[PDB]
Structures are given as C-alpha cells and as structure tokens.
C-alpha cells in the first residue's frame, strides 16, 4: 500500500522538490503544502479564496474593484530557489511571493503594490506557466518564466518569456523584468504560446512549448525547443529549434524529462498525435541535449557569420517573429567572443532545420501526460503517466519492444501531472493526479522471498541472488555473484 497524500476539499496543480533537502512543496487550489520526503504534512498555508476579477489590478479591494467576486486560487508556479520558495497563484494577475524554505508559513517577500511588470503567471488555470531559477551575472537569483497567452481581462500584453529578478536592490521591485529582459514578440494571440517545460543545463536555459506556425496556411501548432543563455537577463542568444517526433506526425508535445558519458543528458518528451476534443496515439521521443546544442550552435554560427547559411550553402537560420533583424556576415572571431550575442547581433534566431527523432515507442489510444526517466545497470527505464490516471513502467534496454512491463491506476480518469519527480537516490518516484500524490518505489524486489515469485513478478530491477537467497538488484548481489534476472523469461529457478 503506497504512501499517499490525498488532501480533501482541494485539487492539486504543481509539485516542486528541494534538491538540497528532499522537502516537497505542493501547489493546490487555495492551498500550499510542505511535505517531508515520506509525504508527512509539515505545514499548510491557505492561499484563497480571495476577492478578485481578471479585469482588476492587485491589491484587489472592493472600492477600486466593484466587480470583484470570491475567486479560488489554483497554484500556477512553484519553484525552489537557493534562498526561497517562489509561488505564483492564478488570482491577482498572477503576482508572486517568496516563502521560507522549511517554514512555508513565513513570507519572505511579497511586493505591496505590484505594477504591470510584476504580473508573472497566467491568470487562468487552463493556461500553463513554466519557470526555472538561475543565478545571474550580478550574483543574484533570476526567475525565467514561460507564460501562455491569456485573452480574458487585462494582461494579454505580458511577454511570453521573461527573466525576472527575485532579490533586486529594492525588494518592492521583486519579480519585475528589465525592459530588455523579455522575448519581444507581437501577435501573441496569434502565436498562442503553450508552454510545457523549462529546464537548464550548463550555461543555457531551455523552453519546450507549442505555438502556431504562421507561415503555414493551416496556422497549425508546432512543437519547439528554444535555448537562451542562462545568466545575462537578455534574449540576444535566443534561438528556436522546431521539434519533429516522427517528422511531426506526433506534433503536440505534452510532457518531458531530462536524464543522464559526460554531458550525456538526454531530453525525453511525449507527443500526442491528436489534440484534445473541443483515438489518437502518443510517442516518446529522445533528443540528446548535445544534439540540441549543436543545432542551436550551428543556427547561431550560420546567422552570425554566413548570412544564415551552413558551410554547404544551405539556408539553415533566419529571424523569427517579424522582428526587424537579419542574419549577418560578421568576422569569425565573433563566435568565440560573443557566444551569447550582444544588443546588435541578429535576434531572435530560429532554425529552418528541425530537430528530428525517431520514436522510442508508439502507443495507440494512450495520451501520455507525464515522463520521468532513470537508469539501472546502464539501461534506460521510463516511467510514464497518461490522461486516464495510469502510471506505466517501460524497460528501454536490449530485448524490449517499448511496451510497458507494469501499469497501475493512480486515480482513474485524472491525468498524471507532468510534475513527476524522483527522490535523491532514484529509489522512489512522486506521482500526482489532480486529487492525490503518491510515493511509488521504483522496484519492490524485497517483497519476494522465494526465487519463483522473484522471477514471476518480471521487473528489470529484480533478480534472484543465488548465493544470498534474496530477490534484489544486481548491485546488491555481491559479498558479482550469480543473479537470475526476472526479465529473462527463458531462464528459471534452479
């Protein structure tokens, strides 16, 4: 019976894990929870309901907002920074606050009179907000925010990607962005950015998102990964790469994870063939971050020094979003001197060449909504959640077709959140639907005390250590002694 947290009278939205302590933070409707690694409740903070209107500006009080009605507050963004928990709700134009780590109840910073540059998150629960935290070139913490388009109420003018200050000189300016700390993009309602994930590696921040390809008469949504330098607060280095899972046949990216050969990080992302109704199939596609960086680097080098062309002459780079910019023919010393650009280099760059992947696996009738990937004995294992509330486990090593070896219902009819995360040791996985959070062990080998039940509950982690009389992992079969893999059906007990 797995450990669970099922809060009554609320729905869940986001899960954030502190990598230094393991403490879990749970964003819910009108609630924030602080949980131990074993899902014990350490604090409960009420965030709503509040008086609000999407046509009113915070702080919302009756005199200046006569149309205000009581409004519930689904969490829109939940992120651990080195010194604080960043929290942005759906109410009050998506304004944010900072709370103390390990004492959620204590507020650290909440601007008293926030202005137009401090409306961070989408004010609509159905529009996603993604974020990531990073240290900036002045030593201070930065918050990258990808925010989708909102139509209803003031706040359709917020830039789709922004870089905001978490601890600026004046605390009251917290969460605001400088004038150039944004992706300057018009026709926001037409592109209609839908953000799926944001992550960092090395000196780069990455965004995964959907947006309309306005150069196609279909005006159809396409999946993109964009890279921007992680610390400068500028978008000079922004480069946009289209993603192609089976040529774009699986077009609507849903969820992703990064997993770890040096700098061998790979992005695993799930893609749906069909959009949700106003049938279909899902695929898992792998994009090694080194390949992501080479294409981004090649896009930049072509735009900077070869008028957007590769060394063979091919047009590979161009300027997006109808910005008055063009690629250039700068001296080649530019590439080592300004890897992240300047306020005069061509921007915002995009690649004509999509990043392509052949699906790891293709499942009909399943809409994958969550991805987490780990390794065991050098071989990839994927944990995948779907729109019906099921968690699937898939061995991706030699001998597999990509079909899951285990499928369990977390909650029937409630999609698994893309906020799937492992614990520090990769021994447990935290899985969340709209109403429940579970701590799931990645393997339960020890539960089997005879060889037959060990080998019968087929699991890539589990095998019978002969000279130990235990169902264990291969790493645990040593005092490397004989280990009967439960994932070798042609091999049985002795």
């Amino acid at each position: 019976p797995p450990t669970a947290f099922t809060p009554n009278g609320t729905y869940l939205q986001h899960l954030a894990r502190d990598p230094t302590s393991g403490t879990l933070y749970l964003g819910a409707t009108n609630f924030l929870f602080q949980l131990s690694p074993g899902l014990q409740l350490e604090a409960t903070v009420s965030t709503g309901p509040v008086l609000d209107s999407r046509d009113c500006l915070p702080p919302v009080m009756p005199d200046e907002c006569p149309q205000a009605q009581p409004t519930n507050n689904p969490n829109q963004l939940l992120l651990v920074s080195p010194g604080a928990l960043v929290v942005c709700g759906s109410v009050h134009q998506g304004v944010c606050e900072q709370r103390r780590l390990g004492q959620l109840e204590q507020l650290l910073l909440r601007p008293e009179r926030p202005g137009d540059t401090q409306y961070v998150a989408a004010n609509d629960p159905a529009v996603s907000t993604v974020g990531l935290v990073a240290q900036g070139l002045a030593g201070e913490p930065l918050l990258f925010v990808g925010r989708g388009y909102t139509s209803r109420g003031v706040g359709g003018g917020i830039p789709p990607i922004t870089t905001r200050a978490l601890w600026p000189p004046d605390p009251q300016a917290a969460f605001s962005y400088e004038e150039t700390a944004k992706l300057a993009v018009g026709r926001l309602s037409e592109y209609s950015h839908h953000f799926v994930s944001a992550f960092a590696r090395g000196a780069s921040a990455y965004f995964l998102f959907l947006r309309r390809d306005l150069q196609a008469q279909s005006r159809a949504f396409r999946a993109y990964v964009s890279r921007v330098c992680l610390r400068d607060q500028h978008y000079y280095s922004y480069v946009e790469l289209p993603l192609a899972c089976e040529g774009g046949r699986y077009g609507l990216i849903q969820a992703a994870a990064v997993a770890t050969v040096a700098h061998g990080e790979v992005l695993f992302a799930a893609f749906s063939s069909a959009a949700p109704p106003t049938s279909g199939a899902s695929a898992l596609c792998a994009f090694p971050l080194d390949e992501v960086d080479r294409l981004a680097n090649r896009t930049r080098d072509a735009c900077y020094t070869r008028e957007g062309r590769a060394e063979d002459g091919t047009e590979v780079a161009y300027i997006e979003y109808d910005v008055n910019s063009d690629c250039a023919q700068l001296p080649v010393d530019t590439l080592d001197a300004y890897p992240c650009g300047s306020d005069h280099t061509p921007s915002p760059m995009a690649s004509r060449v999509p990043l392509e992947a052949t699906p790891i696996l293709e499942w009909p009738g399943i809409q994958l909504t969550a991805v987490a990937v780990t390794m065991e004995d050098g071989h990839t294992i994927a944990f995948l959640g779907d729109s019906q509330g099921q968690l699937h486990r898939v061995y991706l090593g030699p001998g597999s077709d990509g079909h899951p070896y285990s499928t369990q219902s977390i909650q029937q009819g409630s999609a698994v959140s893309r906020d799937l995360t492992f614990d520090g040791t990769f021994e447990h996985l935290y899985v969340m639907t709209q109403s429940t959070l579970l701590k799931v062990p990645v393997a339960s080998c020890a539960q089997h005390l005879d060889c037959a039940s060990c080998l019968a509950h087929r699991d890539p982690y589990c095998g019978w250590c002969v000279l130990l009389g235990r169902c264990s992992r291969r790493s645990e079969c040593s005092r490397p002694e004989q280990w009967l893999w439960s994932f070798q059906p042609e091999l049985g007990c002795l």
Partner: peptide, 15 residues
C-alpha cells in the same frame, strides 16, 4: 474551456 486546449492533462483536469 476553449479550443485552445492542446494539453491532455489540462483537458482531463479542467474540461
């Protein structure tokens, strides 16, 4: 909701 819904998690949870 809206026809702007491309996420199946969003559809499951809010539509």
């Amino acid at each position: 909701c809206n026809s702007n819904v491309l996420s199946w998690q969003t559809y499951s949870w809010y539509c």
